[PDB]
Short mmCIF file of C-alpha atoms and ligand atoms in Angstrom, two decimals:
data_model
loop_
_atom_site.label_atom_id
_atom_site.label_comp_id
_atom_site.label_asym_id
_atom_site.label_seq_id
_atom_site.Cartn_x
_atom_site.Cartn_y
_atom_site.Cartn_z
CA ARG A 5 -9.31 -73.30 28.43
CA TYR A 6 -12.14 -71.38 26.79
CA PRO A 7 -15.69 -70.69 28.02
CA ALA A 8 -18.47 -72.61 26.19
CA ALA A 9 -20.30 -69.29 25.57
CA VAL A 10 -19.96 -65.48 25.94
CA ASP A 11 -22.12 -62.45 24.97
CA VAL A 12 -19.24 -60.86 22.93
CA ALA A 13 -16.30 -62.68 21.29
CA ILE A 14 -13.53 -60.33 20.12
CA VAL A 15 -10.93 -61.34 17.54
CA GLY A 16 -7.57 -59.62 17.97
CA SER A 17 -6.17 -57.35 20.66
CA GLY A 18 -5.00 -54.25 18.79
CA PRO A 19 -6.34 -50.75 19.65
CA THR A 20 -9.63 -51.19 17.67
CA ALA A 21 -10.57 -54.57 19.25
CA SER A 22 -9.37 -53.07 22.60
CA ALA A 23 -11.79 -50.12 22.03
CA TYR A 24 -14.74 -52.61 21.89
CA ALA A 25 -13.56 -54.21 25.19
CA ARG A 26 -13.27 -50.79 26.88
CA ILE A 27 -16.67 -49.33 25.90
CA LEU A 28 -18.41 -52.63 26.60
CA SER A 29 -16.70 -52.70 30.06
CA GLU A 30 -17.78 -49.07 30.71
CA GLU A 31 -21.34 -49.16 29.20
CA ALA A 32 -22.47 -52.84 29.45
CA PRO A 33 -20.72 -53.98 32.69
CA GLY A 34 -22.45 -57.38 33.12
CA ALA A 35 -21.78 -58.63 29.58
CA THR A 36 -19.29 -61.55 29.31
CA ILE A 37 -16.48 -60.85 26.85
CA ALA A 38 -13.75 -63.17 25.57
CA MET A 39 -10.87 -61.56 23.58
CA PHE A 40 -8.70 -63.96 21.54
CA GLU A 41 -5.24 -62.99 20.27
CA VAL A 42 -3.11 -65.35 18.11
CA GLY A 43 0.19 -63.87 19.30
CA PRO A 44 1.73 -64.14 22.76
CA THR A 45 1.66 -61.56 25.60
CA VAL A 46 4.91 -59.60 25.22
CA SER A 47 4.44 -56.79 27.79
CA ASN A 48 2.91 -55.74 31.15
CA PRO A 49 0.14 -54.71 31.54
CA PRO A 50 -1.04 -56.83 28.52
CA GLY A 51 -0.68 -54.91 25.27
CA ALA A 52 1.67 -52.22 26.67
CA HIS A 53 4.28 -50.69 24.33
CA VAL A 54 7.53 -52.66 23.97
CA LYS A 55 9.58 -49.38 24.20
CA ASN A 56 8.47 -48.98 27.86
CA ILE A 57 10.50 -52.25 28.57
CA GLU A 58 13.72 -50.80 30.05
CA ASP A 59 16.00 -53.83 29.37
CA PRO A 60 17.18 -53.77 25.72
CA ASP A 61 17.68 -57.59 25.50
CA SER A 62 14.17 -58.24 26.96
CA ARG A 63 12.83 -55.55 24.55
CA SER A 64 14.42 -57.33 21.54
CA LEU A 65 12.80 -60.63 22.65
CA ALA A 66 9.36 -58.99 22.95
CA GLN A 67 9.80 -57.63 19.37
CA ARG A 68 11.01 -61.03 18.01
CA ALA A 69 8.05 -62.92 19.63
CA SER A 70 5.72 -60.44 17.81
CA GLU A 71 6.96 -61.36 14.32
CA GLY A 72 5.02 -64.62 13.79
CA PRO A 73 6.71 -66.60 10.98
CA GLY A 74 9.32 -63.85 10.39
CA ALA A 75 10.73 -64.21 13.94
CA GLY A 76 14.07 -65.55 12.66
CA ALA A 77 14.34 -63.02 9.82
CA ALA A 78 16.66 -59.97 9.53
CA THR A 79 14.87 -56.63 10.20
CA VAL A 80 15.14 -52.90 9.21
CA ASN A 81 16.50 -51.07 12.29
CA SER A 82 18.71 -48.33 10.81
CA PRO A 83 18.24 -45.49 8.27
CA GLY A 84 20.77 -47.16 5.94
CA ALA A 85 18.58 -50.30 5.85
CA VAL A 86 15.45 -48.21 5.02
CA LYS A 87 17.23 -46.49 2.08
CA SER A 88 18.68 -49.82 0.83
CA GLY A 89 15.14 -50.96 -0.11
CA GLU A 90 15.77 -54.46 1.23
CA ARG A 91 12.55 -56.51 1.40
CA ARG A 92 12.65 -56.75 5.21
CA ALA A 93 10.19 -55.88 7.98
CA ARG A 94 10.79 -53.40 10.83
CA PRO A 95 11.11 -54.98 14.37
CA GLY A 96 7.87 -56.29 15.87
CA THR A 97 6.35 -56.82 12.39
CA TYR A 98 6.51 -59.51 9.66
CA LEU A 99 6.06 -59.53 5.85
CA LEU A 100 4.18 -61.85 3.47
CA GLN A 101 6.48 -64.53 1.96
CA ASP A 102 4.59 -64.69 -1.40
CA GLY A 103 1.49 -63.22 -3.13
CA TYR A 104 2.53 -59.61 -2.43
CA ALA A 105 2.96 -58.62 -6.12
CA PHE A 106 1.69 -59.72 -9.58
CA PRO A 107 2.91 -58.88 -13.13
CA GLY A 108 1.76 -55.49 -14.44
CA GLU A 109 0.94 -54.33 -10.88
CA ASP A 110 2.92 -52.71 -8.05
CA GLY A 111 1.59 -54.87 -5.23
CA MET A 112 2.63 -54.25 -1.63
CA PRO A 113 6.05 -55.89 -1.23
CA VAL A 114 6.52 -54.60 2.33
CA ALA A 115 2.91 -55.11 3.61
CA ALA A 116 3.41 -55.95 7.29
CA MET A 117 1.47 -57.46 10.25
CA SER A 118 2.17 -57.83 14.05
CA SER A 119 1.16 -60.94 16.08
CA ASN A 120 1.09 -60.11 19.78
CA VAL A 121 -1.17 -58.88 22.59
CA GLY A 122 -1.63 -55.20 21.77
CA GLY A 123 -1.22 -55.63 17.99
CA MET A 124 0.83 -53.02 16.11
CA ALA A 125 0.01 -50.44 18.85
CA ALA A 126 2.57 -52.37 21.03
CA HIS A 127 5.18 -51.02 18.44
CA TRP A 128 3.66 -47.81 16.93
CA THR A 129 4.75 -44.10 17.12
CA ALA A 130 1.30 -42.84 18.33
CA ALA A 131 0.62 -39.92 15.89
CA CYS A 132 -3.16 -39.23 16.22
CA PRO A 133 -4.19 -36.54 13.73
CA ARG A 134 -7.82 -35.80 12.85
CA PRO A 135 -9.05 -36.24 9.27
CA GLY A 136 -10.06 -33.21 7.20
CA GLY A 137 -11.87 -32.39 3.95
CA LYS A 138 -12.70 -35.47 1.83
CA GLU A 139 -10.94 -37.74 4.39
CA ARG A 140 -13.92 -37.28 6.79
CA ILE A 141 -16.64 -39.95 6.43
CA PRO A 142 -19.63 -37.74 5.49
CA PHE A 143 -22.46 -40.01 6.65
CA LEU A 144 -21.41 -39.91 10.35
CA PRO A 145 -23.06 -36.84 12.01
CA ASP A 146 -21.30 -37.72 15.31
CA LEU A 147 -17.78 -38.00 13.80
CA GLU A 148 -16.34 -35.16 15.94
CA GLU A 149 -17.77 -36.66 19.19
CA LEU A 150 -16.42 -40.13 18.32
CA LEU A 151 -12.99 -38.61 17.52
CA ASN A 152 -13.01 -36.86 20.93
CA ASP A 153 -13.96 -40.24 22.57
CA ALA A 154 -11.06 -41.93 20.65
CA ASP A 155 -8.74 -39.19 22.04
CA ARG A 156 -9.95 -40.16 25.55
CA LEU A 157 -9.34 -43.93 25.01
CA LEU A 158 -5.83 -43.42 23.57
CA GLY A 159 -4.93 -40.67 26.10
CA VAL A 160 -4.10 -38.28 23.29
CA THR A 161 -2.25 -35.00 24.00
CA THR A 162 -0.88 -32.09 21.97
CA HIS A 163 1.18 -30.68 24.91
CA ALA A 164 3.75 -33.44 25.68
CA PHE A 165 6.55 -31.41 24.05
CA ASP A 166 5.63 -28.00 25.55
CA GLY A 167 8.94 -28.27 27.50
CA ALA A 168 11.05 -29.40 24.48
CA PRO A 169 13.62 -26.84 23.24
CA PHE A 170 13.19 -27.23 19.43
CA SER A 171 9.43 -27.94 19.09
CA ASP A 172 8.21 -24.30 18.78
CA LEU A 173 11.08 -23.39 16.37
CA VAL A 174 10.33 -26.24 13.89
CA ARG A 175 6.60 -25.36 14.01
CA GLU A 176 7.16 -21.64 13.30
CA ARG A 177 9.66 -22.38 10.49
CA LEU A 178 7.19 -24.77 8.72
CA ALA A 179 4.29 -22.30 9.30
CA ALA A 180 6.16 -19.69 7.21
CA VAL A 181 5.82 -21.91 4.09
CA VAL A 182 2.52 -23.79 4.84
CA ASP A 183 -0.03 -21.51 6.60
CA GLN A 184 -0.70 -18.93 3.83
CA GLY A 185 -4.43 -18.89 3.04
CA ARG A 186 -5.22 -21.83 5.40
CA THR A 187 -7.85 -21.89 8.14
CA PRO A 188 -6.57 -22.75 11.69
CA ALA A 189 -7.47 -26.50 11.55
CA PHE A 190 -5.22 -26.95 8.46
CA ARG A 191 -2.20 -24.90 9.75
CA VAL A 192 1.11 -26.36 11.12
CA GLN A 193 0.36 -27.44 14.67
CA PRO A 194 1.71 -29.97 17.25
CA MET A 195 0.79 -33.55 16.36
CA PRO A 196 -1.72 -35.02 18.81
CA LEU A 197 0.16 -37.99 20.35
CA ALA A 198 -0.97 -41.06 22.29
CA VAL A 199 1.67 -40.63 25.04
CA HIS A 200 1.36 -41.69 28.74
CA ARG A 201 2.91 -40.16 31.96
CA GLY A 205 8.39 -41.82 35.36
CA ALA A 206 9.08 -40.30 31.90
CA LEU A 207 6.84 -39.75 28.80
CA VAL A 208 6.11 -43.22 27.41
CA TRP A 209 4.18 -44.51 24.40
CA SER A 210 0.61 -45.73 24.77
CA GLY A 211 -0.35 -49.18 23.52
CA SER A 212 -3.51 -51.32 23.74
CA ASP A 213 -3.07 -51.33 27.56
CA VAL A 214 -4.15 -47.65 27.66
CA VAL A 215 -7.19 -48.30 25.42
CA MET A 216 -8.32 -51.34 27.49
CA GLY A 217 -7.43 -49.38 30.62
CA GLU A 218 -8.39 -50.18 34.17
CA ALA A 219 -12.09 -50.45 33.15
CA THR A 220 -11.33 -53.59 31.08
CA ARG A 221 -8.66 -55.03 33.41
CA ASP A 222 -10.94 -54.70 36.47
CA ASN A 223 -14.00 -56.14 34.60
CA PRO A 224 -14.69 -59.58 36.09
CA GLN A 225 -16.71 -60.44 32.94
CA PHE A 226 -13.77 -59.81 30.54
CA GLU A 227 -11.11 -62.39 29.79
CA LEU A 228 -8.12 -62.18 27.42
CA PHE A 229 -6.69 -65.34 25.79
CA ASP A 230 -3.29 -65.03 24.09
CA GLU A 231 -1.92 -67.76 21.67
CA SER A 232 -5.53 -68.24 20.45
CA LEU A 233 -6.02 -68.41 16.69
CA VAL A 234 -9.58 -67.70 15.50
CA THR A 235 -10.00 -69.84 12.34
CA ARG A 236 -13.73 -69.28 11.75
CA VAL A 237 -16.58 -66.94 12.55
CA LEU A 238 -19.64 -69.18 13.21
CA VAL A 239 -23.04 -68.26 11.72
CA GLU A 240 -26.35 -69.90 12.77
CA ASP A 241 -29.73 -68.74 11.36
CA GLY A 242 -27.98 -65.95 9.41
CA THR A 243 -26.68 -64.20 12.55
CA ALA A 244 -23.34 -64.26 14.47
CA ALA A 245 -23.14 -67.47 16.52
CA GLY A 246 -19.57 -67.64 17.82
CA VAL A 247 -15.94 -68.38 16.93
CA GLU A 248 -13.83 -71.46 16.18
CA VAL A 249 -10.55 -71.05 18.19
CA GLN A 250 -7.32 -73.06 17.94
CA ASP A 251 -5.42 -73.03 21.24
CA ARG A 252 -1.83 -72.65 19.89
CA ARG A 253 -0.46 -73.91 23.28
CA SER A 254 -1.98 -77.40 22.57
CA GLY A 255 -3.26 -77.59 18.98
CA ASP A 256 -6.84 -78.20 20.23
CA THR A 257 -9.67 -76.53 18.35
CA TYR A 258 -12.73 -75.32 20.28
CA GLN A 259 -16.03 -73.59 19.43
CA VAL A 260 -17.06 -70.63 21.59
CA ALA A 261 -20.68 -69.54 21.30
CA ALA A 262 -21.53 -65.80 21.21
CA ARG A 263 -24.33 -63.34 20.44
CA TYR A 264 -21.81 -60.76 19.02
CA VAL A 265 -18.57 -61.38 17.10
CA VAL A 266 -16.14 -58.46 16.68
CA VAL A 267 -13.21 -58.97 14.28
CA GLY A 268 -10.30 -56.53 14.71
CA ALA A 269 -7.58 -58.61 13.09
CA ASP A 270 -5.89 -55.86 10.92
CA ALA A 271 -6.73 -54.81 7.30
CA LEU A 272 -5.46 -58.03 5.71
CA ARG A 273 -6.27 -60.78 8.23
CA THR A 274 -9.86 -59.45 8.98
CA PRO A 275 -11.06 -60.12 5.34
CA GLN A 276 -8.98 -63.36 5.47
CA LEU A 277 -10.95 -64.68 8.50
CA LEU A 278 -14.28 -63.59 6.94
CA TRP A 279 -13.29 -65.30 3.61
CA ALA A 280 -12.40 -68.56 5.45
CA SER A 281 -15.77 -68.44 7.29
CA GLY A 282 -17.74 -68.32 4.00
CA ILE A 283 -18.65 -64.66 4.60
CA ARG A 284 -17.80 -63.42 1.14
CA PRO A 285 -19.68 -60.20 0.09
CA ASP A 286 -18.47 -58.77 -3.30
CA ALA A 287 -16.79 -55.73 -1.66
CA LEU A 288 -14.66 -57.90 0.72
CA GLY A 289 -10.99 -56.93 0.55
CA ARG A 290 -11.63 -54.58 -2.41
CA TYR A 291 -10.89 -50.81 -2.63
CA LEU A 292 -7.64 -51.62 -0.71
CA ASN A 293 -5.57 -48.48 -0.26
CA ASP A 294 -2.05 -47.93 1.07
CA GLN A 295 -0.79 -44.41 1.86
CA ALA A 296 2.10 -43.67 -0.64
CA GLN A 297 5.02 -42.62 1.58
CA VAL A 298 8.01 -40.25 0.96
CA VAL A 299 10.75 -39.61 3.54
CA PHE A 300 13.53 -37.02 4.09
CA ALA A 301 15.74 -35.50 6.84
CA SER A 302 16.91 -32.02 7.78
CA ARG A 303 19.33 -30.32 10.18
CA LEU A 304 18.05 -27.21 12.09
CA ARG A 305 20.17 -24.00 11.91
CA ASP A 306 21.20 -23.35 15.60
CA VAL A 307 23.79 -24.00 18.44
CA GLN A 308 24.22 -26.05 21.80
CA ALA A 319 12.18 -43.62 27.53
CA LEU A 320 11.02 -40.89 25.12
CA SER A 321 13.35 -37.87 24.94
CA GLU A 322 12.07 -34.25 24.78
CA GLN A 323 13.91 -32.78 21.76
CA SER A 324 11.63 -31.25 19.05
CA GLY A 325 8.42 -33.30 19.33
CA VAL A 326 6.21 -33.95 16.31
CA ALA A 327 4.82 -31.25 13.96
CA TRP A 328 1.73 -31.91 11.86
CA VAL A 329 1.31 -30.44 8.33
CA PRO A 330 -2.36 -31.16 7.65
CA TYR A 331 -3.89 -32.73 4.57
CA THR A 332 -6.19 -30.54 2.38
CA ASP A 333 -8.23 -31.61 -0.72
CA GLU A 334 -5.98 -29.38 -2.90
CA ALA A 335 -2.72 -30.75 -1.40
CA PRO A 336 -3.73 -34.33 -0.60
CA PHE A 337 -0.88 -35.45 1.62
CA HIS A 338 -0.25 -35.58 5.35
CA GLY A 339 3.05 -34.33 6.70
CA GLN A 340 4.90 -35.09 9.92
CA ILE A 341 8.18 -33.58 11.08
CA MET A 342 9.64 -35.36 14.09
CA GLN A 343 12.47 -36.05 16.49
CA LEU A 344 14.23 -39.27 15.45
CA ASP A 345 12.70 -41.43 18.28
CA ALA A 346 9.10 -40.46 17.27
CA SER A 347 9.44 -41.67 13.65
CA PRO A 348 7.61 -44.79 12.32
CA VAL A 349 10.77 -45.61 10.34
CA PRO A 350 14.50 -44.87 11.03
CA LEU A 351 15.28 -41.72 9.00
CA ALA A 352 18.68 -40.41 10.16
CA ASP A 353 21.40 -40.63 12.84
CA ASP A 354 21.39 -37.78 15.44
CA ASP A 355 24.02 -35.02 15.37
CA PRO A 356 26.81 -35.86 17.86
CA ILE A 357 27.79 -32.23 18.73
CA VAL A 358 24.26 -30.69 18.77
CA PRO A 359 21.67 -33.38 19.67
CA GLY A 360 17.97 -32.90 18.84
CA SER A 361 19.03 -30.69 15.87
CA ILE A 362 18.10 -33.35 13.27
CA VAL A 363 14.44 -33.95 12.29
CA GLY A 364 12.83 -36.58 10.11
CA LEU A 365 10.17 -35.76 7.49
CA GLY A 366 7.40 -38.01 6.26
CA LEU A 367 4.65 -37.33 3.65
CA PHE A 368 1.75 -39.79 3.15
CA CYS A 369 -0.54 -39.62 0.08
CA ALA A 370 -4.30 -40.17 -0.18
CA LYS A 371 -5.00 -42.88 -2.79
CA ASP A 372 -7.11 -42.83 -5.98
CA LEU A 373 -9.66 -45.49 -4.80
CA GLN A 374 -10.05 -48.43 -7.19
CA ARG A 375 -12.28 -51.53 -6.97
CA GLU A 376 -9.50 -53.69 -8.50
CA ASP A 377 -7.01 -52.78 -5.73
CA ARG A 378 -7.65 -55.70 -3.41
CA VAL A 379 -6.54 -58.46 -1.13
CA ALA A 380 -7.79 -61.80 -2.56
CA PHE A 381 -7.60 -65.29 -0.94
CA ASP A 382 -6.71 -68.73 -2.34
CA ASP A 383 -8.15 -71.83 -0.61
CA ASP A 384 -5.65 -74.13 -2.42
CA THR A 385 -2.65 -72.43 -0.70
CA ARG A 386 -2.49 -72.09 3.13
CA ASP A 387 -0.29 -69.65 5.12
CA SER A 388 1.92 -70.21 8.31
CA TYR A 389 -1.29 -70.11 10.43
CA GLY A 390 -3.22 -72.55 8.15
CA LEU A 391 -5.49 -69.86 6.68
CA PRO A 392 -6.23 -69.09 2.96
CA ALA A 393 -3.08 -67.39 1.56
CA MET A 394 -3.20 -63.69 0.72
CA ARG A 395 -2.97 -62.45 -2.92
CA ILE A 396 -2.41 -58.64 -3.11
CA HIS A 397 -3.53 -56.92 -6.34
CA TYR A 398 -2.37 -53.31 -6.04
CA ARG A 399 -1.52 -50.62 -8.58
CA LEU A 400 -0.78 -46.89 -8.56
CA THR A 401 -2.82 -45.08 -11.25
CA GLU A 402 -1.69 -41.97 -13.30
CA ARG A 403 -3.37 -39.73 -10.66
CA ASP A 404 -1.46 -41.58 -7.86
CA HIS A 405 1.88 -40.93 -9.58
CA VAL A 406 1.05 -37.21 -10.06
CA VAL A 407 0.13 -36.88 -6.33
CA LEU A 408 3.25 -38.77 -5.21
CA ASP A 409 5.38 -36.45 -7.44
CA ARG A 410 3.81 -33.38 -5.75
CA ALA A 411 4.64 -35.03 -2.36
CA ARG A 412 8.29 -35.46 -3.34
CA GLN A 413 8.42 -31.69 -4.21
CA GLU A 414 6.55 -30.66 -1.00
CA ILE A 415 8.76 -32.68 1.39
CA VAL A 416 11.87 -30.87 -0.04
CA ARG A 417 10.14 -27.45 0.40
CA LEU A 418 9.41 -28.35 4.08
CA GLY A 419 12.89 -29.79 4.62
CA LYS A 420 14.58 -26.64 3.31
CA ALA A 421 12.24 -24.49 5.48
CA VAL A 422 13.42 -26.09 8.77
CA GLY A 423 17.12 -26.10 7.78
CA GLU A 424 19.82 -27.83 5.74
CA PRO A 425 18.65 -31.18 4.31
CA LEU A 426 20.83 -34.21 5.26
CA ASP A 427 19.97 -35.88 1.94
CA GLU A 428 19.95 -34.45 -1.56
CA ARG A 429 16.80 -36.32 -2.71
CA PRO A 430 13.53 -37.40 -1.06
CA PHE A 431 13.04 -41.19 -0.87
CA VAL A 432 9.79 -42.97 -1.83
CA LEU A 433 9.17 -46.06 0.27
CA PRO A 434 7.89 -49.28 -1.38
CA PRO A 435 4.09 -49.93 -1.33
CA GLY A 436 3.10 -51.28 2.08
CA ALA A 437 5.63 -49.05 4.00
CA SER A 438 3.04 -46.76 5.60
CA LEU A 439 1.43 -49.72 7.53
CA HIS A 440 -1.86 -47.90 6.93
CA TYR A 441 -4.07 -50.13 4.79
CA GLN A 442 -7.68 -48.98 4.52
CA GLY A 443 -10.89 -50.03 2.72
CA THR A 444 -10.81 -53.86 2.93
CA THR A 445 -13.97 -54.16 5.14
CA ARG A 446 -15.23 -50.61 4.47
CA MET A 447 -18.33 -48.99 5.85
CA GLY A 448 -21.05 -47.44 3.66
CA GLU A 449 -24.64 -46.18 3.81
CA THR A 450 -26.29 -49.07 1.95
CA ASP A 451 -25.51 -52.69 0.97
CA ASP A 452 -24.98 -51.89 -2.72
CA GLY A 453 -21.94 -54.16 -3.26
CA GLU A 454 -19.30 -51.45 -2.55
CA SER A 455 -19.19 -51.79 1.28
CA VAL A 456 -18.75 -54.68 3.69
CA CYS A 457 -20.35 -53.07 6.79
CA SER A 458 -22.90 -50.45 8.00
CA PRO A 459 -22.09 -47.03 9.66
CA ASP A 460 -22.10 -48.97 12.99
CA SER A 461 -19.36 -51.31 11.56
CA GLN A 462 -21.89 -54.21 11.42
CA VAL A 463 -21.31 -56.58 8.46
CA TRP A 464 -24.34 -56.23 6.12
CA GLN A 465 -24.50 -59.99 5.43
CA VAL A 466 -24.23 -61.14 9.09
CA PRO A 467 -26.18 -59.36 11.89
CA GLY A 468 -24.18 -59.47 15.13
CA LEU A 469 -20.85 -59.66 13.23
CA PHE A 470 -18.88 -56.39 13.54
CA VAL A 471 -15.58 -55.43 11.86
CA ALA A 472 -12.84 -53.19 13.31
CA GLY A 473 -9.68 -51.48 12.10
CA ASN A 474 -8.15 -49.41 9.32
CA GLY A 475 -10.01 -51.69 6.84
CA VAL A 476 -13.26 -50.04 7.97
CA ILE A 477 -12.27 -46.58 6.60
CA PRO A 478 -13.97 -46.00 3.19
CA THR A 479 -12.66 -42.54 2.28
CA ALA A 480 -9.38 -41.58 0.52
CA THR A 481 -7.12 -40.61 3.47
CA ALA A 482 -3.55 -39.43 3.91
CA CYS A 483 -3.50 -38.93 7.73
CA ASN A 484 -2.43 -41.68 10.24
CA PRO A 485 -5.61 -43.81 10.58
CA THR A 486 -5.56 -45.36 14.12
CA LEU A 487 -7.45 -42.49 15.83
CA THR A 488 -10.24 -42.63 13.19
CA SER A 489 -10.37 -46.47 13.30
CA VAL A 490 -10.75 -46.28 17.12
CA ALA A 491 -13.47 -43.58 16.71
CA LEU A 492 -15.37 -46.00 14.38
CA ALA A 493 -14.80 -48.88 16.88
CA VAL A 494 -16.37 -46.66 19.61
CA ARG A 495 -19.54 -46.18 17.52
CA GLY A 496 -19.75 -49.93 16.83
CA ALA A 497 -19.16 -50.83 20.52
CA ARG A 498 -21.88 -48.35 21.57
CA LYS A 499 -24.40 -50.01 19.18
CA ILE A 500 -23.57 -53.36 20.87
CA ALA A 501 -23.78 -51.88 24.41
CA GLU A 502 -27.17 -50.24 23.65
CA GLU A 503 -28.50 -53.53 22.25
CA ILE A 504 -27.24 -55.63 25.19
CA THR A 505 -28.40 -53.23 27.94
CA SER A 506 -31.84 -52.73 26.27
CA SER A 507 -32.46 -56.44 25.40
CA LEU A 508 -35.18 -58.54 26.98
CA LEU A 509 -32.93 -61.62 26.18
CA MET A 510 -30.25 -63.11 28.46
CA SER A 511 -26.90 -64.98 28.23
C1 FAD B 1 6.57 -48.82 13.70
C2 FAD B 1 5.10 -48.47 13.62
C3 FAD B 1 4.71 -47.13 13.67
C4 FAD B 1 3.38 -46.75 13.53
N1 FAD B 1 3.03 -45.43 13.78
C5 FAD B 1 1.77 -45.10 13.69
C6 FAD B 1 1.38 -43.74 14.05
O1 FAD B 1 2.13 -42.84 14.43
N2 FAD B 1 0.03 -43.49 13.92
C7 FAD B 1 -0.91 -44.38 13.47
O2 FAD B 1 -2.08 -44.01 13.44
N3 FAD B 1 -0.55 -45.65 13.14
C8 FAD B 1 0.72 -46.00 13.28
N4 FAD B 1 1.07 -47.31 13.08
C9 FAD B 1 -0.01 -48.25 12.71
C10 FAD B 1 -0.88 -48.67 13.89
O3 FAD B 1 -0.10 -49.43 14.83
C11 FAD B 1 -2.11 -49.44 13.42
O4 FAD B 1 -2.91 -48.56 12.60
C12 FAD B 1 -3.05 -50.03 14.48
O5 FAD B 1 -2.33 -50.85 15.40
C13 FAD B 1 -4.19 -50.81 13.86
O6 FAD B 1 -5.04 -51.22 14.95
P1 FAD B 1 -5.94 -52.55 14.74
O7 FAD B 1 -6.56 -52.79 16.08
O8 FAD B 1 -6.95 -52.33 13.66
O9 FAD B 1 -5.00 -53.76 14.32
P2 FAD B 1 -3.64 -54.37 14.88
O10 FAD B 1 -2.93 -53.35 15.68
O11 FAD B 1 -2.79 -54.69 13.67
O12 FAD B 1 -4.06 -55.69 15.65
C14 FAD B 1 -4.72 -56.82 15.06
C15 FAD B 1 -4.43 -57.95 16.02
O13 FAD B 1 -5.26 -59.09 15.70
C16 FAD B 1 -4.49 -60.27 15.82
N5 FAD B 1 -5.08 -61.30 14.97
C17 FAD B 1 -5.08 -61.30 13.60
N6 FAD B 1 -5.67 -62.33 13.06
C18 FAD B 1 -6.09 -63.08 14.15
C19 FAD B 1 -6.79 -64.30 14.26
N7 FAD B 1 -7.22 -65.00 13.21
N8 FAD B 1 -7.04 -64.78 15.50
C20 FAD B 1 -6.63 -64.07 16.56
N9 FAD B 1 -5.96 -62.91 16.58
C21 FAD B 1 -5.72 -62.46 15.34
C22 FAD B 1 -3.09 -59.86 15.41
O14 FAD B 1 -2.14 -60.78 15.92
C23 FAD B 1 -2.97 -58.45 16.01
O15 FAD B 1 -2.34 -58.47 17.29
C24 FAD B 1 2.42 -47.73 13.24
C25 FAD B 1 2.80 -49.08 13.23
C26 FAD B 1 4.12 -49.46 13.45
C27 FAD B 1 4.46 -50.92 13.56
#
């Protein structure tokens, strides 16, 4: 099934692994690439968003097939289920069965993963804000350029709701309580969204791979392919061990470059199982503390055009990221729509930047194996005093914003359990030097293994509140360009 050797082997098929495939297809066109995804193909073109599947029954099946071992488990698909705090995953995702919490620690009880072609971007709500202040990685002089390139790969736009009736009204009402003393980049503005188009549809990994990857004769995608090991020969990346889930057969695929984009929890898991264990691996894990709310606007009368998505930017002084959105553009069900006046109800979400700690980590136990046969995950996570103060300010701020747009549907703001944001950073984080605090270089290349590159939210080292996918793709673009420059300028061959 698999080639004996390739130039680049890519683990996973989410937007960050898809970014490597795209830039390598554009900038190193002759290079052979094999992408391996453990989950099945659930959409067309491969990795497309499940919400673009018109048939609801076929859409439910695509979501169920994405839930790995939690396929036959009850999910959270209503605002009542979110507020009930039941330890369930949202459709298209699955939770850990054990090792999510430990005594004297908060853990991440609702830490979720997706197993399908396209990763979580086959199920996401495409908010693509830019980082600001201390969120920006300071040692990347080209950060702005890479963020603009990430906008290109995701097809990001801030004008999809320029025809929506309530988008300008929500924006101007939030601006009255947010904008005072802020420079233009930190004022209330439309959220940049990864939305395609024939009505406005969500963008998945299919948009990031694009026609450049799909028309590349040298690229091949293998679904139902579990990468169990990253192979190392002479201290450099040598290939991948891959279990063909359609037969149980385990193969070895040789490669000059190995790119792991397997999400923030499974990327350090695969490195740990391969014997690639630097001291910073899986440490400085950070979730974005999340608070939710809902509000009804004060007026009369697949993706709908109601009020769009408003962005309340993070600042160092007010370290949370806000998003005010129409109910179908929310990462979590927040309210039912108003029957008489539709589009008049908006959801509110605040996400907190974390107080980075070395002891917040994802650890692995070789004595216990998970549903895929890999070392089980142990999550050690705890909110500090500073984290609780910031989360308290976020609960106050979300009420201020909710009252500013209208009449709040709920009396109190609701904090979601740790893991709810689905934005886990820092587990394979980049740094300037190999001091024992970072796993990879500014080009996302693992310090310990030349040729081995990491991808995803785990790469982000800073304390961020904003939705991470756009930044993670921007970092993937820099890593993929280092690979393309090395391949195109090498005297060596395949
Ligand atoms: C409901 C929802 C709403 C969201 N909304 C937003 C939003 O508005 N904005 C935002 O920025 N983020 C949002 N997210 C999060 C976003 O989807 C992720 O940040 C993003 O998908 C991460 O990209 P990734 O490529 O690093 O990893 P993933 O998307 O998680 O993909 C990793 C892939 O690797 C595969 N894989 C893992 N281990 C192996 C292995 N050993 N072998 C082979 N394959 C493997 C997995 O099956 C998976 O498909 C949302 C997510 C959900 C589900």
